[PDB]
């Protein structure tokens, strides 16, 4: 029985020494020719109000105009980020929501929460009801108008089919609560973070884990993508954003600072990739420079824990939503 | 006995729903327990961490016993068959009357049974209540470290609020160790370690009362103590001479080397077998320098003696929460009495209404509130053997006259209690004249019924027994009291008698030498008189001298007589069964309970207690005094003592005055010392009840519990005890001896 | 516990035999992307306030 | 049977020494001086009370300018006082609270320190200038020879002369048996004395680096030792309540300043400027002026609560300053 | 511990050959030092 653990240890030692031999340079050293960015000032322009309880998640429309905001009081308001007009107010039959999504087209909106089922709407009425998770729902992302991928707290991810309500591929291979997941911009292979301090990279075709990533010491609350689909930034609960590589299977940069002790909630990259944004428990949001590992600004307007943060598709605005039932659109 | 361990599911955490009934609020928190087993912390609704002291948790109940929501909004939110198997309520409070409910519904299956069981296993530990001074000083550190603010930092209002006596010394001792010291600032929790906390405690208050101890042993000019200078401190001052020197041997130097290796930070003296002046101040609060040994606190008693040879915790009219005349009867006190260590509760049953036959429990003709009998029997069957598996004695006070309800309550007690009732006598002890009662070892986990078989208030005018309710009463059968020379001739040990206090104080003074001989075979029970409408308490040490087992006391009021009753039953595993001394349970060896001289057969003792000093005793600048009472036989009772009031000169006051001299105690195995610290002005601070037959001698730390025997965190006292063996009109002569014990 | 003990030694074996380009080349491509696409990134560059959709 | 010859050669030379001492023993100081006048009633007064520390006070030192004084506390915070107008002109925090000594420069620029952490942290008049490591025990006392030399006395039975710029042990003084507790420099700044625990003070020369006159006599520790102002005598305060007075040119003990009603040890001795009064502080919270030429008490300086752990006269005799274990420091005149 | 007895008697032999100034002249030098310096002590 122990010989299996010995050959597994030798097999992962072949990952260890190949990581060491592939670590020949350092991105903290290559960027020393690059001139810094310095001061970046963002300001509140649209304060979307109208909720009653704490906001748990949000997602931007594909045309960067409408955004859905899932609050704890059983409500999915779909706003207009240009004129501040509540286009819809969707009442769900469950109080505890954790996630909400939007469509690549712009007609479907998913949700989910503690009731273990992913309610898909239509733009209103529930169209489909997706049951089959043994634990609660954490985060859900559409692929197209017919497919969704969900991440549950019973140590798995699932890939559904909307028209038939059947789980196509069930990604298992974790051993902790999958708290967040993020999708590639071309929607071919996605990532998933857990409460094991280990990100994984899954694919939607073969259903297998191709790469694994370690490094943290706590849960992983947020993952985004570099906008070309080659890197990702696992924001965690020990105040350390990182940056990884899909090719070298190695961590590249770490965004750590004293006077930042609180764990973090939601990260997001920029449209180019020079910036990074994170949301902290100390009610603030610190723009990190993605190459020189220094701050560039402070988005401090919130009065409670910044629970969700999202950047548009044309890169113009960011939108934050915290536990004080308010959303703020910075520009 | 086992140290408090926290399993790896409570440290990693679990998700819950903290719901609430009055505010109708709800939140999804994650409960954790720190690895010392000290607190229960969860992130609140605005990121400020809340705590619950785990030594204040009275009970954690789960399943059908947990509280259900009574508001349809919260019931619609939560999901309201087996969804109520994920509920959990944790109760907490200072006293049995005033408790506060914390409601936690789990979001995952099976994370409520373990989360309630492993909190009740942690809240009912012995080594977490009799912890030393070092543990109670590392608890106040964790209370500061876990209560971070919204950023994740130990704030500076907290360290000014915990040590809230003065404010100049706190900010100066913060600035003198390299920390931040303003009024609105914060300290990062990785630059505020344990050593940076104790080096702030040492700069906080000055300690000359340990300088005197080090001068007395010879620490003259060197900044250390040798090995022999510590071994001949332990074996000369910190050794109680009453123990036999063969099975409790003195200290070898190899054990003092282990003590030096454990308690000393400096590496110079650690290799030359020497101990510094900080490695001694860390020894005086050590786990080996305790005021009581760990054999006077666990279940170590001959539990095979008959049931008439034990003091038994008892209560009288348990259902009330206030005075007897305008109170409000509740079912929760049956839980908070049987969990607290009681073993005999009273049921004042009454006759139901012609709507439907249901017996209810209330005080008769007093306009109180009425609770029903079935819920009370449900509570008694719930919280019976959760703390200690020793037999409860249900003392019914029957008042139903209709034959329907007398058969209703005979099936209530047979369907609710089930197999835990005693309906038939045992195989070894039949109900014959001349047999002894069965031991509490042989009645483990049974419930005995006390009811009639075929100035007192409403306990005199009872209702005669029927053939249906009196099938239950076999071993504890109450009769009417004739005389001791009449009860002695019958030789039936399976009866008892119940005296009111005014009628018990007429054979206490008259003929106690027959009274002690009566309490060697049969039981007794004393309830206070019906004129105490404010629920006052008589002294139980009046009737514990003559031998009375079931001395019943009001549990809702906490005066001195209830503090002694709740402190004397903490020992012997909190089981509510304390053994009698040997001359109150032997048949031939009689003695006088009012004697003024020592008795041949009982080794006397002598006790000298000197109050040195004590720390962190208040939260404002006011003086402190200390009362050292002593209860027991009426010749050992001396409550006149009191130190002088200090001036509040520091965090710790020092008292410079003569010792207190208890030169002769006639029966040491029954007496108990009461050290209670007060403020100047009558305010209470803390107290502790220590048995004299197992107290230790030397320089020790007394850790003061509060008014209802729960451990306070910061305050303590340092005393010097010296305990050693002794070296050599009647109704007024016996009623002037009890003038100190009565009040 | 045993089928998982074969699944893990399969999962590490299918991970170990992959192509691992150097961190110098990866950081070179990652650095080359940012200023090549920074001309059309409205977070670093300020906004013409007439064409700003939120002002 | 070879070590018995070395042991008998050891003890016979002790006999040859102790015969040469009683060969010079002719009289005593009291029998010689017994026609001199007494001193009388020396009634003193607390001039200033320098509050400001937060723990015990283990050592102090007077400046050579007779105006400023340093006083090493136990929280790890030296304070340099201005004895005329009571203002704390300096307040230097340390890295280790357990401090057993301090010093002051003859120039007035370098204040040293020490304690339980084996090092001597020379400061500049503020920041750490050096960290003199190399001892394997606690550092009991350390004194300034000049602005370039310092001489320590550590608890590993060794004294040492150091170099303040390179930080190396220049000359090493070895030959004791117990922990070295106190030390004092002569007025010609070329020889000191080392009062270790085993009832024996020795006489070291700083240039040849080896002992030349070893005294015995006590039965306890030696917690203090301080020179007469001519560089010919000193006084070794001890733990069995016996202040002595030895002579350098005679290599014998002259007086013993014992008493009845006193059984408490000494923590600090010092002579005066005139060499008439032997000010000594006791471990029972009281200082007693000993008349040095008649071995009798002459003044009582008792105003401290806990024990008096450090005492020092100035270099013109105008003041004497005591510091005790109750975080207060008084200047007596 | 063989050379320690030689190292002891070396310092003893160095202690032996020194000068022997008498106690009467030493105490007279002490009194002559005190009587010539008792004019500049502000305590006295
Ligand atoms: Ca009653």
Residue numbers in the entry:
A (entry chain B): 4 to 126, 133 to 340
B (entry chain A): 13 to 92, 97 to 470, 576 to 849, 867 to 881
C (entry chain G): 8 to 62
D (entry chain C): 2 to 126, 133 to 340
E (entry chain D): 8 to 51
Tell me what the authors wrote about this structure, in their words.
pmcPhospholipase C-β (PLCβ) enzymes cleave phosphatidylinositol 4,5-bisphosphate ( PIP2 ) into inositoltriphosphate ( IP3 ) and diacylglycerol ( DAG ). Their activity is controlled by G protein–coupled receptors (GPCRs) through direct interaction with G proteins. PLCβs are cytoplasmic enzymes that must access the membrane where their substrate PIP2 resides in the inner leaflet. They contain a catalytic core, a proximal C-terminal domain (CTD) with autoinhibitory activity, and a distal CTD with structural homology to a bin-amphiphysin-Rvs domain important for membrane binding. In this study, we demonstrate that Gβγ activates PLCβ by recruiting it to the membrane where its substrate PIP2 resides and by orienting its active site.
We also determined the structure of the PLCβ3 · Gβγ complex using lipid nanodiscs. We reconstituted Gβγ into nanodiscs formed using the MSP2N2 scaffold protein (44) and 2DOPE:1POPC:1POPS lipids and incubated them with purified PLCβ3 prior to grid preparation. We observed only reconstructions with two Gβγs bound and determined the structure of the complex to 3.3 Å. The two Gβγs are bound in the same locations as was observed in liposomes with comparable interfaces. A model for this structure aligns well to the model built using the lipid vesicle reconstruction with a Cα rmsd of 0.8 Å for all proteins. We also determined the structures using lipid nanodiscs; however, the lipid vesicles permitted structural analysis of the enzyme-G protein complex on lipid surfaces unperturbed by the scaffold proteins required to make nanodiscs. The membrane in our nanodisc reconstructions is poorly resolved and the complex appears to be associated at nonphysiological orientations; therefore, we cannot gain any information regarding the positioning of the complex on the membrane from those reconstructions.
